[PDB]
Design a binder for this molecule. Structure first.
Ligand SMILES: *[C@@H]1O[C@H](CO)[C@@H](O)[C@H](O)[C@H]1NC(C)=O
Ligand SMILES: *[C@@H]1O[C@H](CO)[C@@H](O)[C@H](O)[C@H]1NC(C)=O
Lengths: 172, 319
């Protein structure tokens, strides 16, 4: 993708994460955990389902048209009829081919984008209390219990509470 | 200071391959097929009105051939026409066959209107040995064979009917073609014969041809069928110095013609589907189909490809 997160600085996905498209995996003094991020997950699902709805249902309600099969050739008039249909099919085949290719290219970019938005959101939360390890992981430079981790995931983390402890660990 | 928090994304063991602009084989977590490549082995009678012609093609149904009586009064969204339809009458050719067939199918209904034509000295209701409905020599029940007086005399005949109705009328009339010069003089009188059907705007006339033709039906003669549309405010004149297969009436024409015909051998079933192909109905929400270019109703668009997968998930990178 364009943002280089999925199949990028995140080396792979998590088969364990089964209740979301994106989430957090942590480790602290008391253990480890994986939890889904709903906002990012929902942001991607909504965008993809939007594509699905624009697609499924447009109006091709056709009744009386033209003959498309022939026993024997008749010449001029039959040639035109066949040529007309053959031209139609190639143009619609082309449209279907390009559409899927475009939609798919975009969908992959959107999902890569949503991964990166999540990473960036969390990066901004942590301020000077954490350092980017380079693999979609932050080293947190202060003791951070389960309530602390949950405060990061639910967006209530207050960096000022830990900043003194964090600055001192980072730089000395 | 060493707690760690990692941001990530889901993955499955095995995903689906999709195409993009730059890569025709990318693995994504979920995908949705956009090309319907499965059809039903029957045709759905709902919610579209399908009329099964069975043994009659739509031309024979309009003519009133033996065994086409069920098609009388019938209204259809789609007329289903069987490939094993069989000719069951004194037989024929329609010069502009496809155009007549198209007009009848598009019109959508078989609503026949009776009207009686005062033919002069000339007989009526001539029948045949190649057109026998239940055991007994007959003819197209919408047509009327005129034959010779007893005292051999067929005057020039002209009648006229005037359309003051609020709809356009479709008259279907024929012209008989004898094998010999004797057959004509037998049947009756003149040599040559001839028919001239006029409207205000037009005038169509035929002189019968007389020759050795192959043996279909078991006779060497044939009928040539024609049609004339009479708008509200127009008239139709029949002139005959001989050989007219005269009409018993006119068909009613819908102002808006929204119907059509589908030629297939697929049986009609129980399902509900607004989309019918010659291979059977389609029951799908997919935008495209590779089943048949012959498609009628509310249908996906026909395309050449057998599969087009739309990614509904991110790239799949497991472990
Ligand atoms: C018969 O033809 C004459 C002219 O030959 C015409 O004036 C008359 O209106 C016609 N009548 C009918 C009933 O067609
Ligand atoms: C439609 O595609 C399927 C596979 O998706 C293929 O098996 C089938 O032969 C195709 N039909 C035609 C008429 O090409």
């Amino acid at each position: 993708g364009l943002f280089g997160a999925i199949a990028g600085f995140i080396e792979n996905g998590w088969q364990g994460l089964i209740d979301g498209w994106y989430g957090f995996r942590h480790q602290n003094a008391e253990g480890t955990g994986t939890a889904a991020d709903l906002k990012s997950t929902q942001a991607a699902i909504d965008q993809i389902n939007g594509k699905l709805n624009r697609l499924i249902e447009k109006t091709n309600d056709k009744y009386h048209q033209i003959e498309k099969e022939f026993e024997q050739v008749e010449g001029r008039i039959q040639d035109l009829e066949k040529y007309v249909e053959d031209t139609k099919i190639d143009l619609w085949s082309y449209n279907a081919e390009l559409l899927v290719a475009l939609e798919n290219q975009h969908t992959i970019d959107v999902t890569d984008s949503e991964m990166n938005k999540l990473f960036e959101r969390v990066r901004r939360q942590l301020r000077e209390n954490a350092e980017d390890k380079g693999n979609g992981c932050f080293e947190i430079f202060h003791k951070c219990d389960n309530n602390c981790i949950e405060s990061i995931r639910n967006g209530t983390y207050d960096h000022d509470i830990y900043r003194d402890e964090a600055i001192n660990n980072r730089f000395q | 200071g060493n707690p760690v928090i990692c941001m990530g994304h889901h993955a499955v063991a095995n995903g689906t391959m999709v195409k993009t602009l730059a890569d025709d084989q990318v693995e994504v977590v979920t995908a949705q097929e956009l090309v319907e490549s499965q059809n039903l082995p029957e045709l759905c009678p709902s919610p579209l009105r399908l009329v099964d012609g069975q043994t009659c093609d739509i031309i024979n149904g309009a003519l009133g051939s033996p065994g086409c009586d069920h098609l009388n009064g019938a209204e259809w969204d789609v007329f289903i026409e069987r490939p094993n339809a069989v000719d069951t009458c004194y037989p024929f050719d329609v010069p502009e066959y496809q155009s007549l067939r198209s007009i009848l199918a598009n019109n959508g209904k078989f609503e026949f209107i009776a009207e009686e034509f005062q033919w002069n000295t000339v007989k009526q209701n001539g029948k045949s040995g190649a057109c026998k409905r239940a055991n007994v020599n007959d003819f197209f029940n919408r047509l009327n064979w005129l034959v010779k007086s007893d005292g051999n005399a067929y005057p020039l005949q002209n009648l006229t009917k005037i359309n003051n109705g609020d709809y356009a009328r479709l008259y279907i009339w024929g012209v008989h073609h004898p094998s010999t010069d004797t057959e004509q003089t037998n049947l009756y009188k003149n040599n040559p014969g001839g028919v001239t059907v006029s409207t205000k705007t037009s005038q169509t006339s035929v002189v019968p041809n007389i020759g050795s033709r192959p043996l279909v039906r078991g006779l060497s003669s044939r009928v040539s069928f024609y049609w004339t549309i009479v708008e509200p405010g127009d008239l139709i004149v029949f002139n005959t110095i001989g050989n007219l297969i005269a009409p018993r009436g006119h068909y009613k024409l819908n102002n808006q013609k929204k119907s059509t015909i589908l030629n297939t051998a697929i049986p009609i079933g129980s399902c509900v589907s607004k989309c019918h192909t010659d291979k059977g109905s389609l029951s799908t929400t997919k935008p495209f189909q590779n089943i048949s270019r012959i498609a009628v109703g509310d249908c996906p668009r026909y395309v050449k490809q057998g599969s087009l997968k739309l990614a509904t998930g991110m790239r799949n990178i497991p472990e």
